[model samples]
Target: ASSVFLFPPKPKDTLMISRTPEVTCVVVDVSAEDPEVQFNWYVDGVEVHNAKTKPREEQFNSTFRVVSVLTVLHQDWLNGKEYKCKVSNKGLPSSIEKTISKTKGQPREPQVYTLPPSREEMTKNQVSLTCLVKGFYPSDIAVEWESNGQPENNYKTTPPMLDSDGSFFLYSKLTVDKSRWQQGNVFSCSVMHEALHNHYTQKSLSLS
Candidate 1:
């Protein structure tokens, strides 16, 4: 058997989803060396495929620690489902099963900021947009970016920062090559919070 752990550790019960735009099941498997090591991923009790391998390492006693991820959509998370990961190998206890469940949580509004101050900083270079979701509890959340009224994907995000008050802060920044931002062109970020379950809470800044 292996010593497995699910990240962000559960608090003695079903984990909280809060108001996230997406969900990803992360698995960490640590076990004694077995040439036939394999893994199985599940969501809502149904086995899923393509458990993406992140990184692996070999330790003392011929043991190994492996990491993997299984992505789940916001709807799947909203519908409330269970997640599990199983590992098998040529060793004692042969099979190991780990399960986690979830519940909805509460969230407050988010704050927005931009580097270089869009209006005065507008150039033929880059645009930086960040929406900070602060004081949110449970797990991580998502933020989508848009430029010129179009969905944009050329951006980077950081892992949620846990606050001392047991809340979370998420940030999303965009790096655009050119400026289509006029005093009216759009540069916005959207987030889904419990406050607006029907839609996302959005903050937009124009090139004033």
Candidate 2:
């Protein structure tokens, strides 16, 4: 075709919007033969100002790539406000839009699974026990390990990870001496979260 192909701005598949404790940023990009384009920001469908636009260094066949960013306060973002980016060109009849927000569904409770060391691990001088905490909302959680009702110090916990189902999951590991397991000690994993009224949930395992 003799006519130049025009590429319109759109959202990236993943991480189009990212946030930290202080700020949230939304990004949009486009590649087109024409350098002139427009980017606009909206909060909850209302137009907003202070959006930044810039061009990338990559250029071939006079086709240019441009990036647009919209940043807003994280405090406002936590209020479940939806942010939208509108990209348009004078040649186009309508603008392309993308929206993002931090809020998803309702809060969810978590499930905990406690596992003792494998038989193979029991043979070693030092063994590790595992606790899996999955399917939760709001991400904030606490994990603790105890041996025979006494707080244990030899444990590590992972940060909450997003699940495929929009929930969160994490792992806790406890390392103990083989002699302790051989002596019929009971090990328990405890979880605390806002989802529970008492904010306490536990799972226990014993060799005996």
Candidate 3:
């Protein structure tokens, strides 16, 4: 009941921002289940003191499991910053370190497609535009839709899906009125990710 094991699972490195102008969040979790485990949070290599630690625990017939979580704010993961979570336990020979970084890599380019193969799809009052972005890293991705140079608001999307590899995928949809499908309009799906290096990956489909 005193040994703690840790690993840097890809889900441990997460980022959330853009809620407000300055609101930001970065989370890192290290899996360790020993009662003697100690967790430390760091921002940009600087230690965090008096910070809150959330440990998820489970118990079985003769075993106990726990996951320690650390959360940081808007100012912690920027300026080439690094967020780290360290685990220490008396039964371990070394401290386990998990990190959240912004320099990892770019997101996969999105593959855009239309539903119903662009035929008979507009028989109803609306049609669907779907986009799939796969094999990307650092799951902080923003997806947008534009129709004929205007922003699209009515859409459905699921949360990012993680793959067996250390990469992630994103999905989005935009619904448009069939009437707009008559002209040579365009429906574009645009994405913004840290890996894009301030650029955009956008694809469009003609709405004719």
Candidate 4:
């Protein structure tokens, strides 16, 4: 004797949209027994052409599973523009659209500078280089050192000093090996801030 069983599966579909000023990408996922799914990607209600897609596992920021994919490439999306992603299975209706907006430009360019007076007379082993930058919003910043046009291993420290006026500040120090220091070798300090869009300020000192 043979037995037959049927399970009623829930129809689940999800759409996600992400965009930047220069580009936008959309992702869609549908869960069903059908072998193929339909996806419609749109910008301001108009369909996009030459979009990309694939079938793979679907994972939300909170969970994971297998589903479909959709992507859109529009370079002129513009900041603050809105985009949408929609998906559906053959028998089921299209899922609700998901929308997102592109991020705006940064607040302002940060002010950066190097610290300490000329310390060229000290021996290489005893020399200390410090670089400081101020007036950064969002506070995420980094410092790097370069020697003779080559990048050095960056040493970073945390817990930046904050002024009473709510401005952010950072300080970095560099130490060099005496053997590597030559009479004309150049050392520079550079600072990069995220909100400031990677603006860099550098100061160089030469050994005597």
> Which candidate should be chosen as best, given TM-score against the real structure?
1
Task: For model 4, give the RMSD to the true fold.
Answer: 11.6
Q: For residues 137-184, what per-residue lDDT tens digits would candidate 1 score against the true structure?
A: 554355678766789888787777877876777677777654455445
How many clashing residue pairs are found in candidate 1? Answer: 0
TM-score of each predicted structure versus truth: 0.54, 0.50, 0.52, 0.45
Tens digit per residue, CA lDDT, model 4, 134-189: 66654544567898789877445444576565666776776666545545677787
- Clash pairs (backbone) in predicted model 4: 58-65
The parts of candidate 2 lying over 4 Å away from their true place are 1-104
Leading candidate by lDDT = 2
lDDT of each: 0.59, 0.68, 0.58, 0.49
Candidate 4's clash total is 1
Over 1-208, each residue of candidate 3 has an lDDT whose tens digit, in order, gives 2344332322223223533112122222323444365667676788877445445444444544445544444444444467666766656766766665554554454344444225767577887777877767666666778876788899887777887886877778777777675666677887765556443577787744
Q: Any runs in candidate 3 off by more than 4 Å, and if so which?
A: 1-42, 47-80, 84-120, 164-166
Error of 4 at 156 (Å): 4.5
Clashing residue pairs in candidate 2 (N, C-alpha, C atoms within 3 angstroms): none
Clashing pairs in 1: none
lDDT of 4 at 195: 46
